């Protein structure tokens, strides 16, 4: 759908049998999700943002349905204020930025 | 123009007589530029990012060319690692997110 930027672009995602709300985020290379339970294995990782670096658990390849659209990729779970869908999944649902 | 997100969506801005590149960031409510020489005076603000919070100078009423497009807005200048243009200016250059 087309989404204007007068408001945060949040979408509903279902991950892991749970529904979440997440921000669509063109500056983020990676999807980062607030602490939640996934089944399976993960790797420790660190990413930086404004403010600092956080240590995060890298899970792949997780199925996520974002709006209607299914995608599979790496998600990282950690101490983020908000669930962020970054460009690794945005490419997968065909998202463009248009001005 | 239409950007796909296989790379980071970078644009040239002209800000304060200086040419820079910045990231078009739908997740960022506020535009934050690395420290630079801006005239005029300002107010301290803090904003929060993913690794915590950063303290920045707030200038209002700043002219930016972002691609061909002039906008006038609030710019925070401070300890970011990238120049981010956020939704306060994105909305002025008429940016849409599309999937
Ligand atoms: O993959 C990532 N990093 C990797 N590291 C290594 C490999 S990959 C990664 C994934 C998600 C987010 C980010 C880090 N990140 C942020 O920290 N901010 C804070 C931000 C940026 C700009 C403005 C504001 C703002 O307006 N804050 C405000 N607070 C109060 C009022 S306004 C906030 C938000 C997201 C956000 C919003 C609210 C709370 C928390 C975060 C941006 O929207 C993101 O795109 C991105 C920007 C960025 C990108 C690269 C390096 C540094 C910074 C990085």
UniProtKB/Swiss-Prot annotation, chains A, B:
Result when mutating residue 24 to I: Confers resistance to amprenavir, indinavir, lopinavir, ritonavir and saquinavir
Record annotation: effect of changing residue 10 to R: Confers resistance to indinavir and lopinavir
Effect on the protein upon substituting residue 10 to F: Confers resistance to amprenavir, atazanavir, lopinavir
Any coiled-coil regions, as ranges: none
Effect noted on mutating residue 54 to S: Confers resistance to lopinavir
Impact when changing residue 93 to L: Confers resistance to indinavir
Effect noted on mutating residue 36 to L: Confers resistance to ritonavir
Regions crossing the membrane: none
Phenotypic consequence of residue 50 to L: Confers resistance to atazanavir
Function: Aspartyl protease that mediates proteolytic cleavages of Gag and Gag-Pol polyproteins during or shortly after the release of the virion from the plasma membrane. Cleavages take place as an ordered, step-wise cascade to yield mature proteins. This process is called maturation. Displays maximal activity during the budding process just prior to particle release from the cell. Also cleaves Nef and Vif, probably concomitantly with viral structural proteins on maturation of virus particles. Hydrolyzes host EIF4GI and PABP1 in order to shut off the capped cellular mRNA translation.
Official protein name in the record: Protease
Whole sequence portion shown: 489 to 587 of 1435
